[PDB]
């Protein structure tokens, strides 16, 4: 019985004053306390004050911080259902990925509802029928990746140049980009429906390596300098090191695998199954996998905190759940009306973006 | 521990120190014994003593309980991130049950606790006459433990004001007992329920308990973003009915008394 | 342990039992808590309590120590072959140091004890004004720990009468310390030194200690068959000067008051 109620979100003071001035003109021509949300200062911070804590922390342990609540500030409008989002905290440029079109937005301007993007990019103009499923961003913000189903290749855009243009088509004619991946190395990774993975060098645009497996096994892919992780409908789990070029571990499950995650400060591997079980595995000792959290709804996306303390989940059941690493228990809850497909996180740890229905929403983190 | 023992021995002769704080520093058993010996000495006049994240042994709990059995001029005590067993909890609550206790505030946030000691906790709450503030944190009381606690509370002999529960793994079943206790608790003033799964119907029941004229719950700590439209409308109705009720996520920000003198 | 809780709960309304004995029965922690709770109320009127082989561990000692600290009309307590810690012994000494304690005799025969608790025992002996009989058995007090005890014994402020050190790992070196303590200790009346090795020279010092006119000791637990012929002549000389002295190997045979009523 959710019975959800929707209200204007920001209620910014400038908007309130503008609304007040608009009414007076209409009244003149007709003859013929209040709570406002703090704006995003310069598109970087909110400038709020932190919350109190029951006790002081240890002198050595100052950097470890955990969040409490999430507050939404802006809503981004796209007429079609969105599939992926990108943050790009350095340039304050948010990218929204949908089935048909891609748009780019800037967070400098203050507005309740954003309808006009700074740049609009569509891949359906080039070909007769273009269906897009995947997208990816680079840490250096010098490249933008977008893969499609019937699109013959993958298109790279560069944000360093004064103008946006297509770098290379990098064709995969018979293979649809179910999975798209990238690394710190210049090297490109991608997975497709027919259990095939083909690998190209951006500098020279040549195929260097091909991998083959059973069908539906390329639904997921995890990249590391010495670890390549692969799993799909089969539920076989394979870890590969390019150096000695052989599968390291094989693992079996009762159901399919969709979600994987990695932790930067110390390796941990998170598993999401069709029956809704979260399994955690450490990549140092390499002994055993363990499960601590179970969800009735299928889990589609996952992400980890830059600090290495909390992970938030997005699933079929229109819910957002955030946990912690020591026990796996959830610490706060925020539900949404639509089925949440995507998720995102910021390297700075101040913002967060999630999208379920055609439009996208931007939230703010409190510490 | 040697430095702590020397410091306590030096402070033994002192008599003008009322507020003392010692945190994050390892303290030995002999240090706790010497501190209790100093406390037993008259003219101590030490009101507030704060100790957190300093390992305390089981025997030291015995010394603390013996001091608490006949204690004056010692109002506030804190213990956080300290290993306290359920048997130690029973010993502590028995020591508190004695009428010669003036401890207004007790804080036990991260002490590992289970559901068994909750019955003794309810008994001591019912018997105690001077405890005002009680706080609990990440310790998992359990559904049965909260049920027993609320059964002890609904009788409402205790005059405690502030109760804190956070990440105690609550469910929707205990909400009925909580609402029943609140409905006959004119003394209760502040309450916190954060990081605990509460269903929709539990939220309606709690809102109805808030709306009852008997309840005087003023400070409540909850996150409004987690709940649906109907719960938000009900909370707005609660604010309409009582003009002095405020709901804010940051429950620890409110300070009725100086608790963060050391934190500043 | 479930059965034992029933008896004390039933006895809670009793006003008759002055002597209660239990032994060789497994007892839980909760039984001790209720038993301690049993004596908490007035009109308990229970003098002697014996629990030899009952397993008492951890907080149960703290439960007793809290009760004993502020207690009266409970004179005789005995624990034997039940494990206690040195720290638990330290907790008991602090309670016994309080003026509000009338416990006459205390027995710990096979309880494990070491040298560390001896210093706290030495301080307790001097200040205590209500303890008469102290019994220590198989516990290894050691040579150094015993020497610490004689310093409190030498100061002679204590009024204890009967002391027992059987199989306390005495040696030849500590013989000098005991002789000084016996030299100036008019209050001491009965002593036990059995299953302990003494130097022939040290016993020559010990025998001279007995002949001292200042000593007023009447009961000695020693086996005359153990020692040297010259010592035997010195031992016979002790009886010649003082006709009232008695030297017998069987020290537990003598009963100033009823102690083996349960064994009877």
% residues in beta strands of chain B:
5-15%
Beta strand % of chain A: 35-45%
Count interface residues per chain for the largest interface.
A-B, 25 and 30 residues
What's the total count of β strands of chain A? 27
Most strands sheet of chain B: 9 strands, parallel
Rg over alpha carbons of chain A: 22 Å
Structural class of chain B: alpha/beta
Strand order of the largest sheet of chain A: 5-1-27-26
What about the largest sheet of chain A? 4 strands, mixed
* Estimated radius of gyration of chain B: 20 Å
Number of helices of chain A: 1
- Helix count of chain B equals 9
Family (chains B, C): Belongs to the NLRP family.
Keywords (chains B, C): ATP-binding, Cytoplasm, Cytoplasmic vesicle, Golgi apparatus, Leucine-rich repeat, Mitochondrion, Nucleotide-binding, Nucleus, Repeat
LRR repeats (chains B, C): 16-36, 45-65, 73-94, 102-123, 130-151, 159-180, 187-208
Main location (chains B, C): cytoplasm
């Amino acid at each position: 019985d959710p019975q959800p109620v929707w209200d204007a979100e920001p209620q910014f003071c400038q908007g309130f004053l503008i609304q007040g001035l608009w009414e007076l003109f209409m009244d003149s021509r007709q003859k013929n306390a209040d709570k406002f949300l703090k704006p995003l200062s310069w598109g970087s911070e909110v400038l709020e004050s932190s919350c109190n804590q029951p006790s002081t922390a240890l002198w050595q342990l100052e950097r470890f911080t955990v969040p409490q609540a999430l507050q939404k500030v802006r809503v981004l409008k796209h007429q079609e259902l969105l599939l992926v989002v990108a943050v790009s905290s350095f340039t304050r440029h948010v990218f929204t990925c949908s089935q048909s079109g891609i748009k780019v937005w800037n967070l400098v301007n203050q507005v309740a509802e954003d309808r006009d993007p700074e740049s609009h990019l569509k891949c359906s103009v080039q070909d007769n029928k273009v269906y897009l499923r995947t997208c990816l961003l680079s840490s250096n913000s010098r490249t933008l990746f977008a893969g499609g189903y019937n699109l013959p290749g993958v298109i790279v855009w560069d944000l360093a140049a004064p103008s946006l243009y297509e770098k290379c088509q990098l064709p995969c004619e018979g293979l649809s980009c179910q999975a798209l991946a990238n690394t710190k190395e210049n090297m490109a990774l991608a997975g497709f429906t027919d259990g095939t993975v083909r690998i190209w060098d951006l500098r020279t645009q040549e195929i260097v390596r091909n991998l083959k497996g059973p069908t539906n096994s390329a639904r997921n892919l995890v990249v590391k300098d010495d670890n390549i992780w692969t799993g799909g409908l089969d539920a076989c789990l394979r870890c590969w090191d390019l150096r000695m070029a052989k599968v390291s571990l094989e693992h079996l499950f009762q159901s399919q695998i969709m979600s994987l995650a990695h932790s930067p400060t110390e390796d941990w591997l998170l598993l999401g199954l069709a029956n809704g079980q979260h399994c955690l595995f450490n990549s140092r000792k390499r002994d055993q996998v363990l499960t601590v959290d179970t969800k009735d709804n299928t889990i589609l996306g996952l992400k980890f905190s830059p600090n290495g303390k909390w992970w938030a989940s997005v699933g079929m059941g229109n819910f957002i759940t955030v946990h912690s690493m020591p026990t796996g228990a959830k610490l706060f809850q925020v539900p949404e009306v639509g089925p949440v497909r995507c998720f995102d996180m910021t390297e700075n740890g101040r913002l967060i973006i999630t999208g379920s229905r055609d439009c996208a929403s931007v939230y703010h983190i409190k510490y | 521990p040697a430095s702590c023992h020397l410091l306590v021995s030096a402070l033994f002769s002192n008599q003008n120190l009322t507020h003392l704080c010692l945190s994050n520093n390892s303290l030995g058993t002999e240090g706790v014994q010497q501190l209790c010996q100093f406390l037993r000495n008259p003219e101590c006049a030490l009101q507030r003593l704060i100790l957190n994240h300093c390992n305390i042994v089981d025997d030291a709990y015995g010394f603390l309980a013996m001091r608490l059995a006949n204690n004056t001029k010692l109002t506030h005590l804190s213990l956080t991130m300290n290993p306290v067993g359920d048997g130690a909890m029973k010993l502590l609550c028995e020591a508190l049950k004695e009428p010669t206790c003036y401890l207004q505030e007790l804080e036990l946030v991260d002490c590992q606790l289970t559901q068994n000691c909750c019955e003794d906790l309810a008994c001591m709450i019912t018997t105690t006459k001077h405890l005002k503030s009680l706080d609990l944190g990440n310790n998992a009381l359990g559904d049965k433990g909260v049920i027993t606690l609320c059964e002890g509370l609904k009788q409402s002999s205790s005059s405690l004001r502030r109760l804190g529960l956070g990440a105690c793994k609550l469910t929707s079943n205990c909400c009925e007992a909580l609402s029943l206790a609140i409905s006959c608790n004119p003394h209760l003033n502040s309450l916190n329920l954060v990081k605990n799964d509460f269903s929709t119907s539990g939220m309606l029941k709690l809102c109805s308990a808030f709306q009852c004229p008997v309840s005087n719950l003023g400070i409540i700590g909850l996150w409004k973003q987690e709940y649906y439209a109907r719960v938000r409308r009900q909370l707005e109705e609660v604010e309409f009915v009582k003009p002095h009720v405020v709901i804010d996520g940051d429950w620890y920000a409110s300070d009725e008394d100086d608790r963060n003198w050391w934190k500043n």
